[PDB]
Design a protein. Structure first.
Length: 102
């Protein structure tokens, strides 16, 4: 185990250009509203989604999220557009109803 937020979270969706918002059950089995910012977490590396303190959004458009995986279209260094997918279930975690990067 190294996180697993999608296991205790529902209604996962993308907000803004690089934001993920969802509801996660707290210790008392109560579902609360929480959000994880991907702009400072996720980045765009040559059109590929990788973890780094850089906003992929600067080279990506039409960002979308489904469950625990993030789907977005990013520009490639050689020119053009390409969408990549990445699983954050490991990076993000559910801390008392809050998405945490650890």
């Amino acid at each position: 185990g190294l996180g697993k937020f999608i296991e205790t979270c529902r209604n996962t969706q993308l907000a803004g250009s690089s934001e993920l918002a969802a509801e996660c059950k707290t210790r008392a089995q109560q579902f609360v509203s929480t959000k994880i910012n991907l702009d400072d977490h996720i980045a765009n590396i040559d059109g590929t989604l990788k973890w780094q303190p850089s906003n992929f959004s600067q080279t990506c458009y039409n960002s979308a999220i489904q469950g625990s995986v993030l789907t977005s279209t990013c520009e490639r260094t050689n020119g053009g557009y390409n969408t990549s997918s990445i699983d954050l279930n490991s990076v993000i975690e559910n801390v008392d109803g809050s998405l945490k990067y650890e």
